Amino acid sequence: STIEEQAKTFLDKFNHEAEDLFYQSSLASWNYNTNITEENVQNMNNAGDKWSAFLKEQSTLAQMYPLQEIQNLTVKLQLQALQQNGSSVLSEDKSKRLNTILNTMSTIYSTGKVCNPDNPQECLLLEPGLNEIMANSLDYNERLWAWESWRSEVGKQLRPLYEEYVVLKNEMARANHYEDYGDYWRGDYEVNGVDGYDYSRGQLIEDVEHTFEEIKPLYEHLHAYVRAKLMNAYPSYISPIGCLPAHLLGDMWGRFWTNLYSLTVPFGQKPNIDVTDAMVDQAWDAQRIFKEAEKFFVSVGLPNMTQGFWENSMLTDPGNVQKAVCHPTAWDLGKGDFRILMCTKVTMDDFLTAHHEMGHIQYDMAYAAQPFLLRNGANEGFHEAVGEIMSLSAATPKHLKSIGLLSPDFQEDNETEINFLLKQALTIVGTLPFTYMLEKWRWMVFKGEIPKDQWMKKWWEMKREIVGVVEPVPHDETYCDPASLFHVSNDYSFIRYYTRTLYQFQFQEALCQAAKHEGPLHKCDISNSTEAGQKLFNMLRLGKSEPWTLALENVVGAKNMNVRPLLNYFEPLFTWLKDQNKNSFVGWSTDWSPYA
Amino acid sequence: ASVYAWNRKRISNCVADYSVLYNSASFSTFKCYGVSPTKLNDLCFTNVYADSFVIRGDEVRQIAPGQTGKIADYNYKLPDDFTGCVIAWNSNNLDSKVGGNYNYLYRLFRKSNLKPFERDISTEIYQAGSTPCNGVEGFNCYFPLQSYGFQPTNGVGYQPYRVVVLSFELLHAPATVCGPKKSTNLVKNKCVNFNFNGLTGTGVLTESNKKFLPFQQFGRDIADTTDAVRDPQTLEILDITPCSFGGV
Ligand SMILES: *[C@@H]1O[C@H](CO)[C@@H](O)[C@H](O)[C@H]1NC(C)=O
Ligand SMILES: *[C@@H]1O[C@H](CO)[C@@H](O)[C@H](O)[C@H]1NC(C)=O
Ligand SMILES: *[C@@H]1O[C@H](CO)[C@@H](O)[C@H](O)[C@H]1NC(C)=O
Numbered sequence A: 001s002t003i004e005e006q007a008k009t010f011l012d013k014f015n016h017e018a019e020d021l022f023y024q025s026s027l028a029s030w031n032y033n034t035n036i037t038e039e040n041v042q043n044m045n046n047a048g049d050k051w052s053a054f055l056k057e058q059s060t061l062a063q064m065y066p067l068q069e070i071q072n073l074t075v076k077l078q079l080q081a082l083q084q085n086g087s088s089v090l091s092e093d094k095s096k097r098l099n100t101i102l103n104t105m106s107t108i109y110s111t112g113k114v115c116n117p118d119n120p121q122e123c124l125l126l127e128p129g130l131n132e133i134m135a136n137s138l139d140y141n142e143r144l145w146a147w148e149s150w151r152s153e154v155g156k157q158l159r160p161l162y163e164e165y166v167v168l169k170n171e172m173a174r175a176n177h178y179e180d181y182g183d184y185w186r187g188d189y190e191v192n193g194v195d196g197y198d199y200s201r202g203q204l205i206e207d208v209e210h211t212f213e214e215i216k217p218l219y220e221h222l223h224a225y226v227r228a229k230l231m232n233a234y235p236s237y238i239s240p241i242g243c244l245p246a247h248l249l250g251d252m253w254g255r256f257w258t259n260l261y262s263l264t265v266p267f268g269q270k271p272n273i274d275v276t277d278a279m280v281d282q283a284w285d286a287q288r289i290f291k292e293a294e295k296f297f298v299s300v301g302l303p304n305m306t307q308g309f310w311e312n313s314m315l316t317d318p319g320n321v322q323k324a325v326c327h328p329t330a331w332d333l334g335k336g337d338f339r340i341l342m343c344t345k346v347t348m349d350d351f352l353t354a355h356h357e358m359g360h361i362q363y364d365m366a367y368a369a370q371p372f373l374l375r376n377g378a379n380e381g382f383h384e385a386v387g388e389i390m391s392l393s394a395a396t397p398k399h400l401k402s403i404g405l406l407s408p409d410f411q412e413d414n415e416t417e418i419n420f421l422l423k424q425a426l427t428i429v430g431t432l433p434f435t436y437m438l439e440k441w442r443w444m445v446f447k448g449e450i451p452k453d454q455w456m457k458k459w460w461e462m463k464r465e466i467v468g469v470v471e472p473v474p475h476d477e478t479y480c481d482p483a484s485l486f487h488v489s490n491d492y493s494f495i496r497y498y499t500r501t502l503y504q505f506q507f508q509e510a511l512c513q514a515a516k517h518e519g520p521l522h523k524c525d526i527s528n529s530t531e532a533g534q535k536l537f538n539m540l541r542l543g544k545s546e547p548w549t550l551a552l553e554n555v556v557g558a559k560n561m562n563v564r565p566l567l568n569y570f571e572p573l574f575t576w577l578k579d580q581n582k583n584s585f586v587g588w589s590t591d592w593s594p595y596a
Numbered sequence B: 001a002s003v004y005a006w007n008r009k010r011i012s013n014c015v016a017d018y019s020v021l022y023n024s025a026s027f028s029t030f031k032c033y034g035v036s037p038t039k040l041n042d043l044c045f046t047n048v049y050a051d052s053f054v055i056r057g058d059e060v061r062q063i064a065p066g067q068t069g070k071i072a073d074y075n076y077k078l079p080d081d082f083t084g085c086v087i088a089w090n091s092n093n094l095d096s097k098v099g100g101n102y103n104y105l106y107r108l109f110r111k112s113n114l115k116p117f118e119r120d121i122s123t124e125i126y127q128a129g130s131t132p133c134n135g136v137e138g139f140n141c142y143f144p145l146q147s148y149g150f151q152p153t154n155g156v157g158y159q160p161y162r163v164v165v166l167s168f169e170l171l172h173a174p175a176t177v178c179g180p181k182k183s184t185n186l187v188k189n190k191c192v193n194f195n196f197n198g199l200t201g202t203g204v205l206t207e208s209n210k211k212f213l214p215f216q217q218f219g220r221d222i223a224d225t226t227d228a229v230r231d232p233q234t235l236e237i238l239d240i241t242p243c244s245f246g247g248v
C-alpha cells in the first residue's frame, strides 16, 4: 500500500517483458547487418516497430506516478528515463515527419557519385571511390575540386530537408515545457532533488565556457609547431602570413590530422614505432592478436571473456559475396549475448580498433548485475572514455616489448617519446575545440537567437577566429555544410566526445595514485596492479544507477569537471612548446588579408 | 516441470546409487550441504523426495539454504541448513531453442514469502494497491506469471542449468534405502571374521555333508549358537564353523 513498493513491482514487470522484446529486436538487427536479403528487411521493420511501440505504452503507464514524493534515488532515475515522452508529444501529422525525414537522410547520404560533370566516364560508390581520394593523394588541384564536389553537389539538396528537421524538433521543447531543444539534451546531466548537489541546466554552458580559456593557449602553441614543417614543402606556393586551407587538415572536416603524419613527420631518419613488418615474420593472425590482449586483462584482474563469444561472433571478412558493412560497432543483444562486428585487417588502425571495440563489450557485462533500465553508462562520456584508457596502456613500451612485437633492442631517447605524445595531442587535444564549437553552434541555433541570414557570417567568423582557417571560396546562406556531418544529421549528441577526454585522464591520475607510481603521469602504468583493477571495476559497475555527479565525488572529490589534472600530463610537452614559440607570431586577429 | 510447479516423487524400496554422479563428468554445481557426498552413500535416512525444476545460470546462487532473493522467495524457498545436495548441469543442447524457449514459467510476485517446501499453483494476481483488478490489465494488476526465455546464444552466466534437489530427513517411516555396499573378496581355509547383512562372527570353512534350507538367512544348532548362513549373492552354499582353539 506504499508508492515505494509499487515502483519496484512495475519495474520488475517491465524488466522481464522488455528484455524478451529487446533480444528479438537486437537479433533481428544483427541478421540484417550480416546477411542482406529481400525478406530480411521486412523481418527487421516488423520486430523493430513493435519494440518501439512497446516503450510508447510503458512511458504512458509510468506517467501517472507522481515524482514529488519518491525519496529513493535508484527508482527515481528509472522513472525519469522511462517517462521521456520523446515523439509522443507531437501529433500524428507531425510524428510522421520524423520517420519520413530520417529515412530520407540515410538514403540520400548513401548515394555515391564521383562522375565528373560534362565528363561522364564512370564512378563508383563512396567507400571505394571517395575515401581513397582524400586519404592518399597529395595534389592540390583536384582536392579543391573535391572540396566543391561534396559541399555543392550533396549539401545543396539538404537545405530544404535539414531546415524542416530543425523546425519541428525545436517545437517539442514547448510541448515538453522546456525552453528549447538544446536545453533538452542538457537534461541528461541535470540532477534535481538533492540539497547541495543540484546541477543547473544553464550553469553547464558557463562552466564549459570558463574552462575554454585555458584550452586556447594550448591550441595556440599547437598550431604554431605544426605550421613549420608544412611550409617547408611549399615555400613560395602558400604565403606564411595567413591561415590554412580547410581541405588540407587530414580529413574532410579536419577533425583528425593522422593523414598529415607522412607529410609532416618530425624526424623521419630514425625508424618509426612500426611493428607491421614485425608481425609478418612470425605469421601473426587475427586469433593470436586477441589472445595476447585477453591475457593482458586477466593479469590485471578483470574477468576473462565468456565461452559464448569466440565461437559465436565473427572476426574477419567472411565469404566473397557478403558485401555487408562492417563498421566497428559494439553489439549488446542482451540475455548474455555479446558480439563484435568488424572486418579485421593487418593495419595500424584495425589493430587499435580491435582494442577500442572490445572495451565496450567488457564494459557491458560489468554492470550486468544492474537492472535493465540502469544497464548503461553513467552518461554518454563514460562508455567512450573507459574504452580508451586501456588503449593508452597498450601503447606503453613494456607491453609492446613484452609480447615481442617491438625489437628487443629499441632505445628510448627524448625524441622517440615527444614525437608520440604530441601526435596523440593532435588527435585528442586538437579535437576538443572542434567538439566544443560544433555543440556550441548547435545550441544557439536550437535556441533560435540566430536569424536565417546570419548563419554563415557567424559560423565562418568563428572558424577564422578560434580555429584559424581562411575560407578557400566564399559561400552564401543557401549552403548547409554544417549539417553534412554524421552525428548532427542523425540526432547524436556530440558533447560526449568533449567529456571523453576529461574523463579518460581523470581515471588515469586516479588509478596511478592507487598504484603508487613514483614518477610523472606520462611514464605511469596501470597494469600489474590488482588493487587498481578492483578500484576501477567498483566504479565501472555502478552505471546509471547512481547520479553521475555522485560518481565524480567517489573518485576525485570534486563535483565539477576539473581540467587541472590534464595539463600535468603534458607539462614536458608544454614547456618545450613554450620555448619553441619565442619568435613565432602566436595569436591571430581577424584577417581579411588573403580574400579581401 | 517449471519452478513454480516442481514435482515431488519419493524414491524408496530400491537402492539409490550416488557413485555414478561423482564420475558423471557432466555436472557443474555438484555441491552438497549438511553432509559429504561420499559419506551419505553407506548411511542415509528415508524421505528421499526429489524436487525437479529449471533454474537459470544466474539464478543458481538464489537457490541455496539460508539464501533469499526473487526465485528463492516467490517460487521455491529452501530452508536454512537444508540437509541435502544440489546437482546442476548444462541443458543448452536440449533445453534451449532459437528465439526463446517459452515453456518454463515462474511466479514473479507474491503477497508473502513462500513457506519452505511449498508448491504454489494459483492464478491470483499481485495486490500492491487497494483497488482490485477485474481481469483487465491496468496500473495495479501486474500479472505475476512470466515465461522464461532461453536461447542457444545465452551467456554462460545465463545458461539454463537442469538441477534437482534431494531432501534427507528421518521420519517414523522405516526401511530406508541407501547406497550399495561394496562386497569383499572370498578367502578360503582361514579363521576369518564375517559380517553378513545383520549378523557377524568369526570362524573357518570346513566340509559339511548336510544341506541347509534355502529360505533362511542364518541358522543355529544348540544354545543360541549361530553356525549356518546362506549368502544371497549367488546362492552358492559355503560352510562356516568356528575355528579351532585351546589352551597351551
Ligand atoms: C545469406 O544471404 C543469401 C543471399 O544474400 C541468402 O541466399 C541466404 O539464404 C542467406 N543466409 C541465411 C542463413 O539467411
Ligand atoms: C532504493 O531503491 C533500490 C532499488 O534498486 C533498493 O535496492 C534500495 O533498497 C532502496 N533503498 C531505500 C532506502 O528505499
Ligand atoms: C507525456 O504525454 C502525456 C500524454 O500523452 C502527458 O499527459 C504528459 O504530461 C507528457 N509528459 C511530458 C513530460 O511531456
Ligand SMILES: *[C@@H]1O[C@H](CO)[C@@H](O)[C@H](O)[C@H]1NC(C)=O
Pocket: A304, A305, A307
Ligand atoms: C577464465 O578464467 C577462469 C578462472 O581462472 C577459468 O576457470 C576459465 O577456464 C577461463 N576461461 C577460459 C576460456 O580459459
Ligand SMILES: *[C@@H]1O[C@H](CO)[C@@H](O)[C@H](O)[C@H]1NC(C)=O
Pocket: A413, A414, A415
Ligand atoms: C634529448 O633531447 C634532445 C632534443 O633537444 C635530443 O637532441 C637528444 O638526442 C635527446 N637525448 C638523447 C640521449 O637522445
Ligand SMILES: *[C@@H]1O[C@H](CO)[C@@H](O)[C@H](O)[C@H]1NC(C)=O
Pocket: A299, A398, A402, A527, A528
Ligand atoms: C608486468 O606484467 C607482465 C606480464 O606479462 C610482465 O611480463 C612484466 O615484466 C611486468 N612488469 C613489471 C614492471 O612488473
Ligand SMILES: *[C@@H]1O[C@H](CO)[C@@H](O)[C@H](O)[C@H]1NC(C)=O
Pocket: B232, B233, B234
Ligand atoms: C546376484 O545373483 C545372481 C544369481 O545368479 C547372479 O547372477 C548375480 O551375479 C548376483 N549379483 C552379483 C552382483 O554378483
